[PDB]
Symmetry: C2
Subunit: 188 residues, 2 copies
Amino acid sequence: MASKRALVILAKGAEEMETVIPVDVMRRAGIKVTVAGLAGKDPVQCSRDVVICPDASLEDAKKEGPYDVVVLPGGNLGAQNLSESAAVKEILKEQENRKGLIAAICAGPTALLAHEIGFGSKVTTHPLAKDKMMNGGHYTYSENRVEKDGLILTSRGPGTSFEFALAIVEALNGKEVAAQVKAPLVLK
Amino acid sequence: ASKRALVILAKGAEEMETVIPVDVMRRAGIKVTVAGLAGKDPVQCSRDVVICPDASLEDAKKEGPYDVVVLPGGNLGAQNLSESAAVKEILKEQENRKGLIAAICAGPTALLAHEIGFGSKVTTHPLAKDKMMNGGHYTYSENRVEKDGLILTSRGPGTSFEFALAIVEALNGKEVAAQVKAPLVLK
């Protein structure tokens, strides 16, 4: 059967929790995750300054077949870097056409806007991110902690990272896997 | 002056349990130092995400005392903290200095390894309870967060936000703690 695969794009200024949590939860679900550094293989300084080292650069990871889900962490600077990246624009455009699940969280969804994706999809973001995301009314807004409209999965913030991560797991590997991975976390 | 925290990062440490507290405490204006138990090299956590310490434990230990030292969880991470002579000395002094010690998941078993806070009311991850209670050195609790005096413990990944916010309240107060929680968009 093999295993599902995830491409997590880590850009300078990314929100540490929104990236680490999903990466952890997914690897627990049995999905092979690749933390692809946007600027290369060098270490990445996040929104609160924790430094995470990419498994590989976005340049290389990009040359490794198709991913079952592309996840974009949040973080003011990180989402910005993602928004301004031609590399990200191509990956997102392609994943979309390939009918591949795309997952963004916090400010992360504003990267879909920058790259004109999912137009017309129901979405949610960080409350303070709504303004930017809804400019030009390209999406319907949601206030659900986790919003999944077809193949566009979005979430509101650090506090929603587990529901976000688990939502991704269910979509990829099913509910039983999701429930098994959830128990140990000792979540409320 | 800002409060200070020392986070001891070891191979096999639970990524989320180390990242969430660091992020949240820094949001609280707390100057935190991620200390690498083994040195200054990147640390491979329980689920393979690699984190770069701010410095090595050796040198973090030399930069004044800390308002709180936190012990991440994770099987291997907890076991490395336990077998660390240096970790035992950091903790002993903190307990003497009447300073907050905070451990989560399997992390509090390091406290048992180093005979810290004996007789204290503590909690751990469900699966780390028999080891934690071996010898009846502690009183067990099931609250998601247990703060018995200067000994603050938690149960696992899903309680990290409460574990971290608990540390913030203890150090910077209730107001600063709620100011930090608001944006996190926690339920």
